[PDB]
């Protein structure tokens, strides 16, 4: 996270850390959406160009964390994965279209003050909240800058405005599709911030003023670097792929 601040305890209890078993290393962000379902970016588990093909046994999912590094006894919970599901039409060859995967824990996890699911949007929430100028929130333990801040001690948080699709498309030469949106301040806007390496797969969330709940509108997917002027962060549009999410849960739950 660039130009954010430390998250508050249990400020983001759906935050999940994907952790590689060997080496013992943060892999990506993720979110808890049920007692047995974790949501992430597909590129965190499958990207053949970088020889990335994680299977069930290679990672664990750490829930309820605050510190980036410390094992936090009686606060965090680590679960083992039963099955990965990568969107079948995820496009790693071109533009990370449909950058989304679901992970199903072996056993259900106990909700607590530090562990609690975020909501997925329905039509109306999406239709109400997904609008340029409206701000969502991004969290993760990724890098504090693209290139003496480097890596943070604890969960970082930042609030970024959604951006008009034509400004998103003009900011990059990458083909950007309807399964994606972009977010970030414009060079003019005086404020700055973004996700960065290590924040991929984490949630872009918004708080509904209608019902006071937090909804995950997005998954941190990619940007051209981090917090560059004229560049934006790209997120997988969770709503547009909700059918897939429902489909998989409804079949393997």
């Amino acid at each position: 996270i660039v130009e954010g601040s430390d998250a508050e305890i249990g400020m983001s209890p759906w935050q999940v850390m994907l952790f590689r078993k060997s080496p013992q290393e943060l892999l990506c962000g993720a979110s808890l959406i049920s007692d047995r379902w974790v949501l992430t970016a597909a590129h965190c588990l499958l990207y053949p160009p970088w020889d990335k093909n994680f299977t069930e046994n290679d990672l664990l999912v750490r829930i309820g964390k605050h510190s980036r590094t410390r094992y936090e006894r009686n606060i965090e919970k680590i679960s083992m994965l039963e099955k990965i599901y990568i969107h079948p039409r995820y496009n790693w060859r071109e533009n990370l279209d449909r950058d989304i995967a679901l992970m199903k824990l072996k056993k259900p996890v106990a909700f607590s003050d530090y562990i609690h699911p975020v909501c997925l949007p329905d039509r109306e929430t999406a239709a109400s909240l997904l609008q340029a100028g409206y701000k969502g929130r991004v969290t993760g333990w990724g890098n504090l800058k693209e290139t003496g801040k480097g890596q943070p001690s604890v969960l970082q948080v930042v609030n970024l405005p959604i951006v008009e699709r034509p400004v998103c498309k003009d900011s990059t030469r990458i083909r950007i599709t309807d399964n994606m949106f972009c977010a970030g301040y414009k060079p003019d806007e005086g404020k700055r911030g973004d996700a960065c390496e290590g924040d991929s797969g984490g949630p872009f969330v918004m708080k509904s003023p209608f019902n006071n709940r937090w909804y995950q509108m997005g998954i941190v997917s990619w940007g051209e670097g981090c917090d560059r002027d004229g560049k934006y962060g790209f997120y997988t549009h969770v709503f547009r792929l909700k059918k897939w999410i429902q489909k998989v849960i409804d079949q393997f739950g």
């Binding site: 601040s5 508050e8 003050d113 409206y134 701000k135 006071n212 937090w214």
Partner: peptide, 28 residues
Amino acid sequence: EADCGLRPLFEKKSLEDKTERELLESYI
């Protein structure tokens, strides 16, 4: 399930985090 989206240390205890106003003020 039915509980999603409300934070045990925030909503459920009627507390607000430091930067969540920023969000609400942007909808206006």
